[PDB]
From a paper:
structures of the Mep2 transceptors from S. cerevisiae and C. albicans. function as ammonium receptors/sensors in fungal development. a central channel for the transport of ammonium. non-phosphorylated, with channels that are closed on the cytoplasmic side.
Numbering used by the authors:
A (entry chain A), B (entry chain A), C (entry chain A): 1 to 455
The structure:
């Protein structure tokens, strides 16, 4: 009544209009497909960080990726989607208008080429990838119940505001003119600086794997690193290629850029390791470099000329390779790989987007931007820096607050203090904890949960 | 001559008309993509059931998934497609009109938005997923030749009739008004009750892994469980999302429901295990719960409001969790996991579809239904029960008949009787069977086929 | 100025026209999706050949697949794309017009239904699959630096010319009328005969695994074989299905053919092994047969009637099964599996395409061909043979030249001579090479690179 297209609410009355008429069906099919591709990046992250670990994590990140997929999907449905994409938000956050996905259907989303329900599906996958990045960063000696509560809270008060600033209809970064093609800020810079908060507050200090004369690379499982990298690169075609919101050739241009940045990042990191080790070929390095390039090109993929995409592989690979060395300086391992690749890689990529963004690339699908230094738009670099600094500051500060607030509550403490924690070898001698004898997650039906030595 | 569109046979003469003009190209692209996604669910099933096993299966289900993909594709081509989708069937079964895919081309399929050849591709994947569910259920001490013959026969006389009733142009369940969005009946309820027939006739009784004080969860490979769950959830976006037959936003709505049911099922099953174990976190349970939710939402995904999808995770997870305990009561392990997840999960999901189906959800793409209890259509619940009971009865009874008929034929007996079966350790002492020494499927070039101790 | 559609260069001025208007958006979405599917075939190849190996390769092919993805993407960007698809080539090769992808944007590609940038993305994946086939063939005792240089050179002077002849606007095989639906020549026949050059020049002679009374199948990792086969079959829907360049039902017809050829190839090879071993069931054989069928149907998938696709499984499976036996005759293992499956399978499939190609199948999307023997076009078989012989001759001869030229240059020698190579067990006793003690690529951060025993 009339139930005709309004652009608001459900978008119209399904008994009176065909809501699908508002959209190009091929745009919808590509974004649906891209959503499925981003989903498989979730276990990709878990495999990557499980495999790279220089320490025996009690919690399997391959499995924790499924836990994160579950917690993030629930959070997104409950209020995460609404806090980012409620068509009625301020400049800093959305509302609870779409609590439990109420009225999320056929109105054109903030990306007008797809309906709200499909944009919900697609963007929810980005929240889930960020959730497993966070769980991976904070996995060492994590308690599962508190971790699940942490992820729910963290998505709500760290991810959702940063996502709103970046993608929301009235988000202040959107208004300012900052560029972030595929959500490098909300996903990579954000998780990376939240990881750093974890490292500096909850991470083990004077860590034996980061102390003195120790190997920079000492992986738990190279096959897991490689499988994770495979799922990440495969899924990243949806992550970046879908960020146009359409079936135009800007989507395919972004995929060409994505592939070339990954390729040049992998080769660059491996070449850097070759020079720095005096001629060794680094198995872990090739994979880390591909990830550095993928992260680097994320804010840029639909904005920069193809030939510049090689720079988004080379420069993040070099800078991230050296950022990893800060683990030796601080003597901290926990959380630091996620910071180095996603935090530093995300910052570098975001900065370089201000240099290389071009109006003629965005215009491939009619997207209008002033451009970067390629168009003599010098001020763009300042907009990029404003975004990167705001994301880093909010993520680091608020993540610190959550971690410490939960730490002060006995039943919510994410990681027990070392002096209250019982040894797995001692638990295994007790009848009611005999299952701690199987310290191998391949055969154990139960998570080897940290137990307080007061029971 | 005139070779113009007829809606029958090949659909028209390719030299005179463009058969593609009858279809929206984006509808076709989504269903082609969804077909590829369902294909990877085949090894997903094999990985899941290989990993969950409390017993050392001689046959690797990861590998058997490829065998099933081969047998099912051949059966479908030969006559399986025709027995379900020959446009000229009765109310109970199709015909051999499309034997060897004769004349399967460009006529609109029973799903009018895609041509016969594409519907053939898509629906063949559902047959193959059901084949590996059956092979998984019946894998313990299976002989490979007889298993392949069994799958061919089973697809023909169990899967194909149930699929016809559900999807066929004149299928009696279609006519009755029963709802089954993505083939929960033909795939999950069917394989589950066929699994139960296997359990009760060919399964080992008084099984040491299901007898007395034994662990409910004791997996062969947690990494295999997790990898299988990953492939299943990823592919299920095609399984459910493609069941609209189109590129409309009902496809994406169904994907949102699919993700939320998996997420809530995983969390629910793990929470149930936490209460029942006195505080342990169940690795296997999270995965089983995700599968329970995916199975649960299958008959419902394109029919129920988004907020109700959480019920399709919670309720099947709880009921299936307790159904697994029946293995202890019966002291039977073989085949029972497939029954618990797919049979019970499928029954529960089908029943709840009668409660929660809504005309306004179906109408998102113009699909007309009376609805469920959400629309005060009380009779819908009875239609659902008629379907579930018919599927369970046909599958259990006919599967029983096939298993027992083959059992009475020496060269077709699927599983040897324990007293006619030689020990692998004894075979390994014989020169012509020395390869039985390698009881590890990771390195052995040959299937460790059960051998009769009469040679 | 006018910047309107020209069909050349960038295709038009993005500030004046919408380049996307020239294309059906659904055609673009399918080819973008198919590109992502072909990408995952890259690690599929690496997993397959790592797993099948009868020898302990020091270089992990699962990991080397990522290296190949990187080298091939860079080569393709640099000049590979231009040498195949520069719209201004001769009959034998393209030009450097599109060096570093200059002006590769929105002009219709040689496949007029997609723009240059998307055809670039898609076809680059084929180059990368061929790169990992080559790296796999030549992996035994390979040195990594020289291997990377080799792949770059090989793509440039072996792959690119053969691809031009097959796909290029003025390619001589195109003009002749030879049929090759999905690039069986450039990918499979080519890599297979290049593998044979490797086998005969650099392969180990009188190899203990191929000498005397030794097992035909003795795999390193069955799980790797199966995982590789899964990724290959899944991705092959894009490899073959995308080779129409469009969203028509010829794409889906090609997928039905692809699935049926894989299925019948797997069953055929396993049945052949069953007869030849006196009743054993071959784990490796089922997988090899699926690959033989997939290779076989590649030149044919969009040209042959569905019922004939079973022949493209059966015949290549039988012939390739016996081709593998030539390893015993020659007493050479290295490189020979790639030759047997891709070289022989590719030759057989190409030949049979001349028998079974049908004008009415090509015409499903308006593609005009004279057809094969199915249309009494007898001369087609000669065109097929001209293509197969030219590919085999160029690949074998030029690959031989490259391998031998690099062999004569100390720092480019791909494989050290056995008498200049130090033992891993001896390197491990030296302090600066202690890491050679860990001969297990699952835990070692470094490639166990062959070292000259002159340092
Ligand atoms: C525990 C947290 C309970 C929060 C549930 C309240 O949601 C409400 O729902 C309305 C639409 O559903 C919104 O308009 C409104 O803003 C919001 O307050
Ligand atoms: C443990 C999981 C808890 C989440 C599931 C509860 C979702 C609450 C949403 O409320 C529902 O929203 C509809 C909007 O249309 C209303 O019409 C309906 O009356 C109301 O019931
Ligand atoms: C979706 C939320 C699931 C419940 C989250 C509640 C806060 C964390 C509860 O976990 C706690 O962890 C302890 C092990 O350290 C367990 O001994 C104990 O049983 C449990 O109190
Ligand atoms: C630390 C987070 C800072 C985010 C807000 C700063 C910019 C506010 C712009 O207002 C318009
Ligand atoms: C062994 C089984 C052999 C069955 C092959 C016979 O198929 C026949 O093919 C016709 C169209 O091809 C159909 O019209 C007809 O109904 C069917 O009988
Ligand atoms: C071991 C695999 C056996 C399956 C392969 C045999 C398929 C038999 C199909 O018959 C063919 O159907 C066409 C329909 O158009 C006829 O035109 C053609 O004359 C006829 O030959
Ligand atoms: C596609 C069908 C493939 C053949 C199926 C025929 C029925 C089963 C044959 O397998 C049998 O299994 C025995 C091991 O138990 C083997 O010793 C014996 O060789 C073989 O007689
Ligand atoms: C046990 C299978 C029962 C299926 C047939 C029962 C319903 C027949 C409806 O006819 C109309
Ligand atoms: C090291 C190899 C350096 C080769 C780079 C030269 O590329 C040139 O670029 C032009 C368009 O960019 C082409 O028209 C021209 O043919 C080509 O010669
Ligand atoms: C180690 C990786 C080396 C590859 C990266 C160098 C790519 C060289 C391409 O040249 C660039 O091509 C543009 C075409 O538009 C010109 O406009 C621009 O002026 C020019 O700079
Ligand atoms: C993208 C190209 C990367 C460099 C390729 C240059 C040619 C091969 C160089 O590798 C060589 O391999 C030796 C081990 O055999 C190493 O000891 C030595 O450091 C190095 O000289
Ligand atoms: C050995 C490679 C042979 C390729 C060229 C031979 C055919 C040339 C056709 O000219 C037209």
């Amino acid at each position: 009544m009339s139930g005709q297209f309004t652009g608001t609410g459900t978008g119209g009355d399904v008994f009176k209009v065909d809501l699908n008429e508002q959209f190009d069906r091929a745009d919808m099919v590509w974004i649906g497909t891209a959503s499925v591709l981003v989903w498989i990046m979730i276990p990709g992250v878990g495999l990557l960080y499980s495999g790279i670990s220089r320490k025996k994590h009690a919690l399997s990140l391959m499995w924790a990726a499924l836990m994160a997929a579950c917690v993030a999907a629930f959070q997104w449905f409950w209020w995460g989607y609404s806090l980012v994409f409620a068509h009625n938000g301020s400049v800093f956050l959305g509302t609870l208008q779409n609590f439990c996905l109420k009225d999320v259907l056929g109105a054109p989303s903030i990306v007008k080429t797809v309906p709200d329900i499909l944009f919900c599906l697609y963007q929810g996958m980005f929240a889930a990838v960020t959730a497993i990045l966070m769980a991976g960063a904070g996995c060492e000696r994590a308690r599962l119940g508190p971790m699940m509560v942490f992820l729910f809270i963290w998505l709500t008060v760290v991810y959702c505001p940063i996502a709103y600033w970046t993608w929301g209809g009235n988000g202040w970064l959107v208004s300012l003119g900052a560029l972030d093609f595929a959500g490098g800020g909300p996903v990579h810079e954000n998780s990376g600086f939240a990881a750093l908060a974890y490292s500096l507050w909850l991470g083990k200090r004077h860590d034996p794997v980061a102390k003195g004369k120790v190997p920079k690379y000492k992986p738990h499982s190279v096959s897991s690193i490689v499988m994770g990298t495979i799922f990440l690169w495969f899924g990243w075609y949806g992550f970046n290629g879908g960020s146009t919101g359409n079936s135009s050739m800007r989507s395919w241009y972004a995929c060409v850029n994505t592939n070339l940045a990954a390729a040049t990042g992998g080769l660059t990191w491996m070449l850097v390791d070759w020079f720095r080790t005096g001629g060794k070929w680094s198995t872990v390095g090739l994979c880390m470099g591909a990830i550095a390039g993928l992260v680097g090109i994320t804010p840029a993929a639909g904005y920069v000329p193809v030939y510049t995409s090689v720079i988004f592989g080379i420069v993040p690979a070099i800078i991230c390779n050296f950022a990893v060395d800060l683990k030796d300086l601080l003597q901290i391992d926990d959380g630091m790989d996620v910071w180095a690749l996603h935090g530093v890689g995300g910052f570098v990529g975001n900065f370089m987007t201000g240099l290389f963004a071009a109006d003629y690339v965005a215009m491939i699908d009619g997207t209008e931007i002033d451009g970067g230094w390629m168009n003599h738009h010098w001020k763009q670099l300042g907009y990029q820096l404003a975004g990167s600094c705001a994301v880093a500051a909010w993520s680091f500060t608020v993540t610190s607050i959550i971690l410490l607030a939960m730490d002060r509550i006995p039943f919510l403490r994410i990681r027990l203090h070392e002096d209250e924690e019982m040894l797995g070898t001692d638990l295994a001698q007790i009848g009611e904890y005999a299952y701690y004898a199987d310290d191998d997650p391949e055969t154990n039906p139960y998570v080897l949960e940290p137990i307080r030595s007061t029971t």
